[PDB]
Amino acid sequence: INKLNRISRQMLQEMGREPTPEELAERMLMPEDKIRKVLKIAKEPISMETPI
Amino acid sequence: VYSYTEKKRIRKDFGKRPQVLDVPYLLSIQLDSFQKFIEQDPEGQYGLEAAFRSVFPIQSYSGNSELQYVSYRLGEPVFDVQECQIRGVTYSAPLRVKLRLVIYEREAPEGTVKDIKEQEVYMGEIPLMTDNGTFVINGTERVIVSQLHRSPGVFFDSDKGKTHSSGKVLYNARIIPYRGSWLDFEFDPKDNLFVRIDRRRKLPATIILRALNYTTEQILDLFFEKVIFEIRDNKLQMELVPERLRGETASFDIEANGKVYVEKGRRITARHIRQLEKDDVKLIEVPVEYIAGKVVAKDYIDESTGELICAANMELSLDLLAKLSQSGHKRIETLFTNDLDHGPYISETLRVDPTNDRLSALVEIYRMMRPGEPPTREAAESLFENLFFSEDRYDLSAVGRMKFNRSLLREEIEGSGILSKDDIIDVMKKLIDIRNGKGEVDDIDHLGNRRIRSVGEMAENQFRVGLVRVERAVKERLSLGDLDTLMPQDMINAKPISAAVKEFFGSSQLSQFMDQNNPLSEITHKRRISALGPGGLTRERAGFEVRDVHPTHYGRVCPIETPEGPNIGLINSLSVYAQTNEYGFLETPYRKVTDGVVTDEIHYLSAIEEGNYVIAQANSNLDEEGHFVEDLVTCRSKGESSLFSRDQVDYMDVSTQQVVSVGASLIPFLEHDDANRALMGANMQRQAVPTLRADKPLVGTGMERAVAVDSGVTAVAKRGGVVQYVDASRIVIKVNEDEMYPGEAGIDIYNLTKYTRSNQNTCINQMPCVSLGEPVERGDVLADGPSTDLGELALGQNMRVAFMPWNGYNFEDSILVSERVVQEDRFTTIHIQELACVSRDTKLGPEEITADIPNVGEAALSKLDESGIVYIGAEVTGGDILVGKVTPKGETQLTPEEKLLRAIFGEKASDVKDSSLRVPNGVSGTVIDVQVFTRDGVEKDKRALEIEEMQLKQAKKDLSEELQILEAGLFSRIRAVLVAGGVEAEKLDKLPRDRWLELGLTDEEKQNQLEQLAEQYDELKHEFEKKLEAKRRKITQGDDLAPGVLKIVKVYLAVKRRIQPGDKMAGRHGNKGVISKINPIEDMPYDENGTPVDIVLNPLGVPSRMNIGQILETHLGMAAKGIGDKINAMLKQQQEVAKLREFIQRAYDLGADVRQKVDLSTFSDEEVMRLAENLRKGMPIATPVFDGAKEAEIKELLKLGDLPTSGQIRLYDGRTGEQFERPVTVGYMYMLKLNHLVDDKMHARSTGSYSLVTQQPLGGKAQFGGQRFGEMEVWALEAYGAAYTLQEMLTVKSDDVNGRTKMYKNIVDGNHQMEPGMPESFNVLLKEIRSLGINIELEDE
Amino acid sequence: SDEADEAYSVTEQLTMTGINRIRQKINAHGIPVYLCEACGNPIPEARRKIFPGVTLCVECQAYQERQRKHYA
Ligand SMILES: [Zn+2]
């Protein structure tokens, strides 16, 4: 996760606009699918008493 | 002198005044503010340059590591607007900055630079503004409402009454800066004067004087005037200033020259002061007792000893007069105190002053700002200088200084940044003088204290906060600063500022969904002031003070348009001609006045600059030259209003409309309505849903055209020319020869926007109105939007009303709508719902979007194609499938005898669970358009390939039609080459156009011109090859979907809701209504000639709610349709152009003075036939709002028709066929259709889903759950003896998760019992009490 | 009933109570006073004839009204 965050900050200005998983799958030499699963997993849970 | 477009139907225009300030472009707030925001602005002022010059340059910890600013840029987006609504991006615009990381050498303060690595760093995506001031943040069109907050400056408040129970009011004075420490002054009920720095402890207010280098002598001679007593050889003489003695006790004989002009005991009335002035007294010989209570200013000490006789500010008693007698003083200084006017305040506060001199005061300030810090000389100096005197730690903004000099009666409106001796002392003088009687207190609401922000300044502040939180990181990464290894982009992070700015534009109490359900709604939403939000006062803290209207609203905020209900007044809607000033306070037009003339120079006034003038009133008849018709005219000077002489006015209102908004200035005959009713009227006009054939206001108010055009919906011509090719999609204006740029003329083209959703789920359509081969002038409308018609804002439809009871069907406010209104489909309104069906990725596997579905035969799958998405067009209804979707659900987990059954019939229990997107239960529509977004990790299916091919054909067609025009322009420029120097006229139209490059020409500059233009041609070629490449690549790519989604399928149903008992309706004046029985034609009333009156409102609502404006509008409408039917008879019985001209001319002059005379003798014979055919439904009528058409004009305009002047026809009932006694009123009233539709509101739930924490009902779909059976209802049921119904209302129907299923089993099995049990909510309560250490149990006996 | 009807009733209440206060102030019934209730000066004819039975001279009235302008 920390690798993806460092490389996402760096790619966010190297490529200018914003990164894509197809491209993180080649900056990071990971298998192009662990990036997807890591990006699905690494997020906190919403406080279920959140006020809408 | 009209145009050829304006002659479609020329609105009869009453209104006596001349307009001198045409209506400003109504969206000035949003556009001009965001324009000040985003632009390279070669001056340090507002804009992004402000924020960058504020936070930059970043210097490290003095370590010769600096990161400075150069300049920035706004790269063009990747997706333009409509693409960005289709796909769902934020219509952003990537930012760029040229930061310049400089590193100085150590052993060098500013010694030779060792590196300046200049690199451009990204940060954030500021969402650009559309042409209509409406951003697009996530696919939906959002709008940021202007805020209204307290201007940093000075304020003099009361807090009158309730405190201290004596009634005595306090007079506090706050000096709020833009940024820094506050400062407050206030009185105590004991009347001593106290100060306080930022809201900390009180203090004897003279302490701050002393801290500013003031000792008691100059304090008392600042805050007091002198009265000298003299000892001239006998007993205590006194100086006589004559006017010192108004309203005072005469406790002594006021003689003069040994003559008695005033006598003891009495009161010195003005007679006495008059006579003393005429009789020249200057030095009166009063006894000692009168000095006995006076106060001595200067210091006195025995000149032989230097011992202190009387300190400054002590009360002279007889003994001290004696003591200083023997010291050789004949002058004595005494404070001119008085209970009325020159009150003792600073003196008695010196009494309260514990301290004595300057250093002690600074010590006390240092001990009140922060406790525990021991006082010190330099610590005190630093702290006090750094409260109010530090350029770094305290700054009134220039707005601050401007208010602070205009609220003191100062001179310069702009000046210093920090306070001074004189600013503080003027605050204190103003405060004491407020309490002395002269002067008054600025109540909160006064728009001289409500500076208006908008999109620009708020977004600027959010970017500012982003810059500070990033320069923290910049200085931190400079802590470890390697001199030449970190380029000027690893110090920064882009996502911080983007996080802040997106949080603002997408999550705010301001940035909110556009009320885009009616062009008036958008243009009354973008013009909006709000007093809530971050930085404004919210409801709880404040509060009733700001709900009020205040006489500085006259032309700066609408008084009769504000959202009624929970937050009145906090949503003040900006006036018609109002503007934001240079500094920010709202300002408005006024016509200047010379000696006695009314100049035509409009001149803007803010709020603080007005009362010192004396403004006239727009309703003033002036005498053909600019002189008033009288010598005295109604005016308003300072809040109050009254008659003034002719030679005193300074300003006349620009026009009679400027008191209102674009909301309430469309209500014709607004002038005769109780203000609450115009409030509800405008607030029900903002909600009219656009009907199917939007007709026109049959009785309007002049502003309706400006609202239709200036809002974005109409398709306004950019340049005047001929119309070459109209079509339901596009309009092709051939630009004229004069409005046509020099190189590559070409032709303008407008791609309209056909059927499509708005936020409120209605149909934002555009239809052409200018037909083929037809001129159009610049600035004119081509294509009407929703609810516009011919460029005249048409929110609802006009129709025939008759005020009369008619059998209780219109009881309270109900309305009775004959079926001639619903057969015609004239309120039939089109609503385009959007249904999404995502396809997610569960742990068991990916959801399918197959057409193969279990447990549903071919029946519900007849409308599905080969791939699971419905065809474009199948008329789905309640409960059908639009997208067949199945989720893999392993572990079927068979049961008992169900297993026996599967054995009995061998039916393979499937592994898949149906979850297809089925139409919501109730709508009934036409699937107008299916879009299929795909994560680009999935192979796009068959239908998505159809869609890609189709969109690509479309885009190819479009971009090729564009290339044709472009190459035609370049061939034009080539001719413009040949035309000078050797053009061969007819040797260029014969041959093919493509073979013009090889045209002969002598090798002068013009041959090189031909070569250059061929270069331009080939550049255009390759440009549009590659641009169509980019279009095909935007289409072909996958989407970038949310995490974990395979493909979403959006399906756009297009329902058509007609009209049905429950649909709210309303006029404009605020007569609500709920159409209540859609009657046959036969039954309705019918006037003697035959026509059945379509609607039938109620008479009991005009007197009780004084909105008599609807009766006057009904009459003007009846007269209007009278003119209409007369033209209809003259046209159907077809007469000629001659009779039509004479008759329309009679209609357009019509009597009283007007500003509309048209003179149809200039209309060609064939325009007047078109004008008639647009009037044959009825002559429109204008009526400017507070300048309308008085009654007698209406009566004559009826007599021009043939209606009865009374306005009331005699009606025959339709059922019994017998005349209504006492003739009724019938006319054409314009009635809207509010979108509180019935079938949106209706709802019923027998057994839906359920909550998850407490087994209660919870449904979603249209809150598909029971009505809240709240508490007061339980009180109701207990009031009756009924208790069984209660027990089941919250044990069986609601919670007890065995009680409800047993109740359902019983209901199906025909045994209406109930077996309650115990509520699951109370069981949760037992558990939540018991998790705490509180053993709650239930005895069992 | 509607939401504007209730607002009309409140506006009637507010203006009626205000006006009836200010009519309660003015006397319109004679109790001939002939000189002040505080200062003793003669009350002139015009003032005593406009407002019958007014205890106070003009100056005493303005002065008490000004001490009360700061609301006690
Ligand atoms: Zn008196």
Curated annotation (Swiss-Prot), chain B:
The record gives the effect of mutating residue 679 to M as:
Resistant to antibiotics salinamide A and B
Positions of post-translational N6-acetyllysine modification: 1021, 1199
Biotechnology section: Co-administration of salinamide and rifampicin or salinamide and myxopyronin suppresses the emergence of resistance to both antibiotics.
**InterPro entries in UniProt:** DNA-dir_RNA_pol_bsu_ext_1_sf, DNA-dir_RNA_pol_bsu_external_1, DNA-dir_RNA_pol_su2, DNA-dir_RNAP_su2_dom, DNA-dir_RNAP_su2_hyb_sf, RNA_pol_bsu_bac, RNA_pol_bsu_CS, RNA_pol_bsu_protrusion
Q: Which family does it belong to?
A: Belongs to the RNA polymerase beta chain family.
Q: How does it assemble?
A: The RNAP catalytic core consists of 2 alpha, 1 beta, 1 beta' and 1 omega subunit. When a sigma factor is associated with the core the holoenzyme is formed, which can initiate transcription. The rRNA transcription and antitermination complex (rrnTAC) consists of RNAP, NusA, NusB, NusE (rpsJ), NusG, SubB, ribosomal protein S4, DNA and precursor rRNA; S4 is more flexible than other subunits. In pull-down experiments interacts with CedA.
Protein name stated in the entry: DNA-directed RNA polymerase subunit beta
From Swiss-Prot, chain C:
Please tell me whether the keyword Zinc is annotated for this protein.
yes
**PROSITE patterns this protein is in?**
ZF_DKSA_1 (PS01102), ZF_DKSA_2 (PS51128)
Q: What InterPro entries does this protein map onto? A: Znf_C4-type_bac, Znf_C4_TraR, Znf_DskA_TraR, Znf_DskA_TraR_CS
Keyword annotations of the record: Metal-binding, Plasmid, Zinc, Zinc-finger
Source organism, top-level taxon: Bacteria
Q: dksA C4-type zinc fingers: which residues?
A: 36-60
* Alphabetized GO MF terms: zinc ion binding
Q: What is this protein called?
A: Protein TraR
Species per Swiss-Prot/TrEMBL record: Escherichia coli (strain K12)
